[PDB]
């Protein structure tokens, strides 16, 4: 056991225009994570195509991971960022999580990961896109895998948190 | 116990261009709310991107909450309102509902909330956007959690209700 | 008991540019009607936003009802018609059906209704939009709740029906 | 019952610009055909609206049938073709199938049919659109109901088939 | 007994503008592969229409296969490539896999295949599109059916793989 149900993770890492913000879901075979993984892959639309995360072509990360963008992709520059530095970052994060035991190795062939990726339209430095997404994805997985933050923990610190875009 | 099935809530709070109108769904692990939560997160389209509600980046509200817009988002101003004052409002409403016992604390880690939010394209006051959405979301949760309004109650007062845009 | 599975209803009522045509689904908790209700509410697109049908803000009809448009909504005029006269009509039809026992009162809190609404882009009379949709929605519910028209009934009268846009027949 | 599981049918009938090509799914209550029927009806997008197939308004065909277009519908001419001659043709094909026993009469009230229809943007003859779609839909139903063509049959004749758009 | 759960395959084959890259899912009746197959066929949008893979019209490959594009289809040239050389290639790959026993013949009538295909907008040689997609689809099926690459294998070689658009 360990990851026996759907868990949701999230994390924002970085700064500048390359800042990464990952919204993530992970779950086992037979769970809604598997259903959304399949429903997600077959459904592409203009500006939003979902693809399997791969460390490189012919080397997908395992557990199977589906990546989808949040910001509308209007040109090749945006498409390559999403499926170049960000994809490699997300995929390496997933595989490093397995290597480090965060995602148990003996569960990796029966889990599905869904990763929502943020790339501001002014992002420019590939190295940062790749690093921040690697870090945000890894943090999201670590959190999701432990069901964190627990509701009691969020309740306790809700009043001290600061949302960047809050009216205040 | 208490929230053992899918419940739907709704509420309109506020006035002017910042008026809030929330269409909401809440349900437990294993229910259609969990399925729609996962199917919803992976599917973004131009003008409509769905994201996890967070009190602030790195502090999502629990229960896991998915937010989606009703009015087409054409620019950054609209995007920030939806995912700034409204998001903070929605997320705080969810966490305050947990703190206040409306959503039992011992159920918060196994529930999913889906929140449709309205922001007129002429909305301008962030403070109101945030406050009205916080209030509308809280009201919708309170209602949904009690399965209100009950059908018998709606039937009794259907003839005296006034829809602002109705012909008659 | 009564509405124990997914049922589909349809009806065209009215004339002129305000003519209503409703494509409807109703089903209980645990059925695909509930799944489509949830999957439908969270998924909005340009020109197509789905909302809960309400008699008025703060007074949604019960059973829970999801409304979706068939004709692309390009401006506020169209949006208000869909979620003004038509919404009020759809919602009242659902609530009147409960009041009249068409939808048993003791099942109303555990059912879901999905309503596809048609409003021609030249529709103009709000009173008609509201009335026709109320009438069409009510007819669709009554039909769906009884699983009508039954297949044997459609089979028997297929040759005499006349489609407004067919080549012939 | 005969049709206890999801079956897929397909058929191309006709020629010229009115040629019909149907991709079809049929299945019983409780199957993925019923789920896709419901998920399909509620989800309309620009250029693609799905509707119940009806022999005529106020007379839908039974089994319940959902129709969806393959070619983007940009104007009223295309919309009326799809939901006029083709709709009537599709709906009559379903009803004639029931009348002829291809779809058992005692199963017709508990089945769902999903019909993808093709109408080239240069199609012009309503009579042909109606006839070809009626014929293609009926052939697809007949094939689907028997699970044909069986895999062994396709395997045997794969080398002699000719795709009109293949390189060879 | 061979293919009892959902498996995911992927492969990139070829070069130049016709290079093929397949993201594939295969699964049995009753699995999320069947659900996504049905939900996928009924849902078409501008630039993205999904169709059954056929060796030729009136001869679909079996197991039932749904094809969907990754690159927005803006004109007939792109549409024909996707549903001509690529479709024939994908469908023949599926049928050859059955003939060769990769997909057991006695399981072929109860399996569903989902194929995401890539065709760069500058692709021009139909013969290559067809051949590369045939080989990439066949490789993806072979991999998927064996649950390959296994997580342990990806972990072992993650550091030596090279992604074309990211790199590290
Ligand atoms: C190795 C990489 N990662 C993968 N990873 C997996 N798992 N699978 C894959 O197939 C890929 N590959 C294909 N990937 C891939 C394929 C299609 C799309 C979607 C297309 O990008 C959509 O069609 C729209 O988002 C673009 O719409 C438009 O925007 C562009 C403007 O050109 P420009 O000249 O203005 O620059 C046009 O190409 C047009 O299609 C995204 C990524 C990556 C390039 C590439
Ligand atoms: C009381 C009413 N009923 C409800 N009922 C429920 N359950 N929930 C609600 O939030 C509402 N309200 C909000 N409702 C509502 C909100 C958004 C949309 C759809 C929006 O219209 C989307 O933005 C797109 O589907 C269309 O986008 C279009 O709409 C705009 C019109 O401006 P205009 O200048 O063209 O006139 C354009 O910007 C265009 O992009 C429809 C109804 C009703 C106005 C209103
Ligand atoms: C902290 C905030 N909340 C979050 N909350 C969660 N859970 N996750 C997140 O990633 C975020 N962040 C990212 N969020 C976020 C990211 C993308 C979109 C969708 C985009 O807004 C659209 O996809 C646009 O790409 C298209 O609409 C438009 O917006 C752009 C601005 O140009 P301009 O017109 O303002 O000049 C244009 O490209 C245009 O296409 C919405 C919210 C918030 C800004 C931000
Ligand atoms: C034999 C082939 N494979 C099949 N395979 C199966 N299973 N079923 C089928 O019906 C088909 N056929 C129909 N197929 C088919 C039908 C519609 C679309 C999608 C339409 O093409 C959409 O309308 C948009 O994706 C295109 O947008 C555009 O492209 C078209 C021509 O542009 P152009 O005039 O600039 O050249 C316009 O209609 C426009 O809407 C794709 C493939 C193939 C042509 C064809
Ligand atoms: C009796 C027929 N079959 C049915 N069958 C069922 N089951 N239910 C129904 O409601 C219908 N009816 C309504 N049906 C129906 C309703 C809306 C759409 C969608 C439209 O075809 C478009 O996709 C709009 O959503 C976009 O609106 C766009 O389309 C128009 C183009 O024409 P134009 O440029 O000549 O003007 C524009 O006005 C624009 O607003 C399709 C079929 C059929 C016409 C009609």
From Swiss-Prot, chains A, B, D, E:
UniProt KW Iron keyword: no
SUPFAM superfamilies: Ribosomal protein S5 domain 2-like
UniProt KW Repressor keyword: no
Pfam families: Fae
Keyword vocabulary terms for this entry: Cytoplasm, Detoxification, Lyase, One-carbon metabolism
Domain of life (superkingdom): Bacteria
Annotated binding of substrate, by residue: 23, 52, 70, 72, 87
pH dependence remark: Optimum pH is 7-7.5.
Enzyme class: lyase
Phenotypic consequence of gene deletion: Cells lacking this gene are unable to grow on methanol but exhibit wild-type growth on succinate. In addition, mutant is shown to be formaldehyde sensitive.
Catalytic residues in the record: 21 (proton donor)
Regulation: Inhibited by the addition of an excess of H4F.
Pathway entry: One-carbon metabolism; formaldehyde degradation; formate from formaldehyde (H(4)MPT route): step 1/5
Recorded catalytic activity of this chain's protein: 5,6,7,8-tetrahydromethanopterin + formaldehyde = 5,10-methylenetetrahydromethanopterin + H2O
Listed GO CC annotations: cytoplasm
Role noted for this protein: Catalyzes the condensation of formaldehyde with tetrahydromethanopterin (H(4)MPT) to 5,10-methylenetetrahydromethanopterin, a reaction which also proceeds spontaneously, but at a lower rate than that of the enzyme-catalyzed reaction. Is an essential enzyme for methylotrophic energy metabolism and formaldehyde detoxification of this bacterium.
Subunit structure of this chain's protein: Homopentamer.
NCBIfam families: one_C_fae
Protein name: 5,6,7,8-tetrahydromethanopterin hydro-lyase
Gene this protein is translated from: fae
